[PDB]
Design a protein around this nucleic acid. Sequence first.
RNA 1: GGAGCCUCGGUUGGCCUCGGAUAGCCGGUCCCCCGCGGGGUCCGGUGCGGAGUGCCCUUCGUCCUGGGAAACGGGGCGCGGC
RNA 2: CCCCGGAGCCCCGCGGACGCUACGCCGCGACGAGUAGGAGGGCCGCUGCGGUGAGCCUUGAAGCCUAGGGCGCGGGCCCGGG
RNA 3: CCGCGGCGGUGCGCCGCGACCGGCUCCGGGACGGCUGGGAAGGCCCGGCGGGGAAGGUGGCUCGGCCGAGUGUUACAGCCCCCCCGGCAGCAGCACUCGCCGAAUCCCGGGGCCGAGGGAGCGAGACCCGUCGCCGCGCUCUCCCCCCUCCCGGCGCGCCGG
Lengths: 109, 51, 199, 236, 56
Amino acid sequence: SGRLWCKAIFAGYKRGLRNQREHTALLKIEGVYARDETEFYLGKRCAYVYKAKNNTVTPGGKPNKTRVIWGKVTRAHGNSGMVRAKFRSNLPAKAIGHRIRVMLYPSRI
Amino acid sequence: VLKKNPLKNLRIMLKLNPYAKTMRRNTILRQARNHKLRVERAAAALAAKKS
Amino acid sequence: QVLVLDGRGHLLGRLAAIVAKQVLLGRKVVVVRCEGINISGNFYRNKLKYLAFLRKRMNTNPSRGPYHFRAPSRIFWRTVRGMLPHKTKRGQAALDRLKVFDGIPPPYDKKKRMVVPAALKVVRLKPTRKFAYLGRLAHEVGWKYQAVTATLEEKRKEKAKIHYRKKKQLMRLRKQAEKNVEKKIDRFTEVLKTHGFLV
Amino acid sequence: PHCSRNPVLVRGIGRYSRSAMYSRKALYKRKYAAPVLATVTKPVGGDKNGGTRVVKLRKMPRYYPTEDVPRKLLSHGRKPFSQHVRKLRASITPGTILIILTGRHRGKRVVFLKQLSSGLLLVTGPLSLNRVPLRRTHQKFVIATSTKIDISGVKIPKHLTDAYFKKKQLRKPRHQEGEIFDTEKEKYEITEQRKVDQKAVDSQILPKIKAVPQLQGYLRSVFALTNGVYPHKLVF
Amino acid sequence: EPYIAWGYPNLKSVNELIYKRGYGKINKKRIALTDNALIARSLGKYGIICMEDLIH
RNA sequence: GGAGCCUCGGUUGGCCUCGGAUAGCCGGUCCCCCGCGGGGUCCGGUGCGGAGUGCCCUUCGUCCUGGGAAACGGGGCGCGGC
RNA sequence: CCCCGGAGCCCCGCGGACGCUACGCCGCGACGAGUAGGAGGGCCGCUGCGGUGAGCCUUGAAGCCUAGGGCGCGGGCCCGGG
RNA sequence: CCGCGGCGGUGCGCCGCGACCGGCUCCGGGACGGCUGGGAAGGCCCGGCGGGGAAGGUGGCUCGGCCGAGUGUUACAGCCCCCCCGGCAGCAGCACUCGCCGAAUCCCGGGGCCGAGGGAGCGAGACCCGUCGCCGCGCUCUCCCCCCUCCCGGCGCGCCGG
Ligand SMILES: [Mg+2]
Ligand SMILES: [Mg+2]
Ligand SMILES: [Mg+2]
C-alpha cells in the first residue's frame, strides 16, 4: 500500500570529460554516499518509468500510457556512493535529473 | 581448445599436474589439524585463567 | 521536496558550488537572506574585485555588455550561474529550479530553512581571517534597497520571536503533560526506550 | 551397494588417498582371476494364407526432408532443471518471516513453511490474517526478516508439493476462430481440497503466531518505504 | 632500463605466470599449454615432459 | 455532476526564534525593573547537543462481534460570526 | 581361434561426406594508422559486339517518382506501389 | 483423433528463473614461514646497583575551605622513570589490529558484473549415440559388522526386520 522502491536520480551517463559512453547510466541513489553504503544495491532491478502519448499494454493490467526501461545496478561508481547502472536500452537524456526507481527485488537479504 | 584456468579449475590443474591432488589434500588436513590445536591451546588458557 | 537555505553565515562561492550540483540533480532550491552571505578576504579586497567586474563592458554598446547585478540575491545567482552549463537547455533548466532572495519573503519566512555547514564561515575560515558581508559590498556598488531590506527583517524577527515564545509555551506544557500522565503512558514509554529513544 | 568409502574433504577432494583406499576397499583379496544373414534379428508376427509374415518394428521412413541440421558436440555438464542442486539463503529458516516483494501480495508479510522440490519457497501469511494463502514464492523476491515463530512441530501435508501448486488450464483445438474459445472459462476456482489444506495448516501455525505479542498485527500490516528510511541503513 | 620493470621472481610467480598464462610456441603458433602432450612433444628431448618440469 | 483529446513531473508531511562560536540551550525565580509577556541578577538542570534534522509528526490492508486499557474526540469538501 | 552384403560401430586398411563450384570446402596461429605512390580483388557500375538464358515484355519494356520491404563493409543491388 | 511418448529443429510478442563453464571485480573465514630464530608489550614477582625528573615531603609566597589548589628550591624514595646485573610458563608479526616481508612456507567458502557461439551420424533385417584425456571416487562381481532410520512388512508414539 506504499512505496516498494528506493529513490534515485539519473546523474548522467558514464563518461570521460569529452567522451560520454551512453550505454552506462550513473545513479545517485538517495541516502547513500560511500563506496561502502552501496553493496546493498549491487544487482538490483531498476526502472526508468515514464509516460507517453500513445497507449501501451501492461502486465496484469489494462492498457496504459506509462512505459518503462528496465535495468540493473552493476557496480559502485567512485567513493561518494554513486552507482553504475546498465539498462536494457540506453536511457533517453531527456531523463537527466529525473527519478529512476531502484527496486529491492533481486534480494540477497 | 578453450583454456580453462588451472588455478581455478581443480581438474585442469590435475590434468596438467596430478601431484596437486595430494598437495591440496594435505593443506586442508594440515590446516584443520592446526586449527583444532589452536582451540585446544585456547581452552587450556581459559582453564588456566579460571584456575 | 524543496531546499530552503539561509544564505547567512555561508561563503559565496562555497555555497554556490553546493547549490549548483543540487540544482543539476533536479533538486529545487531556494536561497534566502542572500545579503547575509559573506565572502572571505577583507572587505576592501572584494570591493575592488567587484569594481573591476563593473569596468568590464562592451565598449561599442554597454547596453549589450555584461550586466552587473547589484542586489545580493542576483549576485549570488550570478555566481551559481557560473557553475552550471547555462548555455545548454539542461543548464537553463537547472537555474530555473534555483530561487534567490534578498532577505526572507513570505513563503519561506514561515518555513524551517537549512544550513550547509560545508559552506559556513565559522567552519571554513580561520577566525583571525577577514571577510566581507555581501550586503555592504552590494550597498556600496549601488544596491538600492539595503535599508528597506533591514526594516522588513526587523519586522520578521519580531514576528518570529512571538512564534517561538508560543512554541516554547507548548513544549513546556508538553513536558508538564508527560509528568501529569506518566503512570498511564508508563508501559508505552518503557518500550520506546528498549529500542533506544528517550535516553 | 555400499556407500562412499572415502568421505568428502572438499568438492572434488576425497579425504583419503589412492593408497588408503586400496586398503579400505581391500583390493588385496578381491582379485578377479578371469581368463544377420538368415537368422532375423528383431521383427516377427503371425497371419493366414501363404504362411506367416515377417513384419519390421521401427520401419524406415516415408519422407526425408531436403536438408536437416547435423547433431551437436556432447557438452559435459549441462543438467536439466530437475537434476539441479537447490540453494537457500541461510537467513530463510522454517517458521521465519518474509516480506514478499513482487506479486499481488506485494509488501504483505508472511510466514515461511518449506522449500519445495523446485527450489521455490512454500509460504503462508495465514489467509486469516493477511489474505495470503498456501503459496509458492522465490527466495530472490522476498526479504528474510529477522523475526521467527517456532514452527518446529507442525505436520505440513506431504501431499502438498510443487506439483500441486501448479497452474492448470487450456488445451489446443476447439472452435477457435471467431469471438470465442478460452478468452472465457473466466475464473480460477479455489476448489475444496485447497481450502481444506489451508484450514489444516493455518490452525497449527495460527496458535503459534498468536503466542508472540503483537505478531498477528505485524502480520496484518504491509511494508513500505517512507521518507528518510533507506533499505541499506535499516535491518530486516 | 627506463623501458622496463624487472627483478627476481618468486616461486609462486613462476607458477602463476606459467599456469594462468603459459603458452607454447608450437610450429610458430602461440598455443595454450592445455596438456603436457604439447610440452613433451616439443621439450621432451630435454627430459622436460610436463608443466611441472618446465617450472623447475 | 458525466464523458474526452493532450502535457507531464511526482509516489507522507515538517506551520518559522535570534544568533553565538575563546561559547551556547532550558528552566525557575525567592528578588528587582519595564510594556499575560520583555530585561536583569541569583540559583537549579542539560552541553560531542535526546526540548537531538544522528531529529520530529503521521501510519500502511477492509470489515464483523465482544472484552479489557484509553474515552468526548472525529466527521458531514457540515454550516454562520470574530 | 570361422565370413562385416553384416564387427555393429570412437575405427573400421571391403565402400565411402550432409562436405568435394578442389579457382571448392575445412582447421589452427598471428596481425589491421596512412598522403605521394604501387599491386590485388570487385556476383560494383555504363554503352556495343559473339555466344547463351525454349529469359522477360501491351495481362505493360525503358525511364521517372516514392515518410513502402530488404540485402550488401562498400561500389551498388533486388523487390512493393505510383 | 488422443497421447505434448522418443528425436529433431521453434518460441507471435513481452518476461522471469535455474544450475554449468569462461573472464573479471570484490567480501568473509581460517592455516603457515622468516626476522635482532623479530622489536616492543603484558603478567608474576624477588634480590640488588646506581643516575634523573621531580614528591605522600619540606619551604617562601599566593588563592580557596589543619585540609584542598597554584608557583619556587635541595633532592633521598614512601609518584614514577632510566641504566646495570639474574629468571620465570603466555606467547603468537597478537582482535588490547603499536610498527614487516612473504606462501609448494596456502587453503576454504561467498557475493556483483559481462559473456556462452563451436557443433568428430544423410546405412540397406540389428543405437538416431555416445563421448577423448583427467579426477577419483563410488559401487559392485569379497566377506564382516555398527548405526541411524525413508519406503514397505511386523510387533509393542516406541521397538524389530530399503
Ligand atoms: Mg504513476
Ligand atoms: Mg591499412
Ligand atoms: Mg593514394
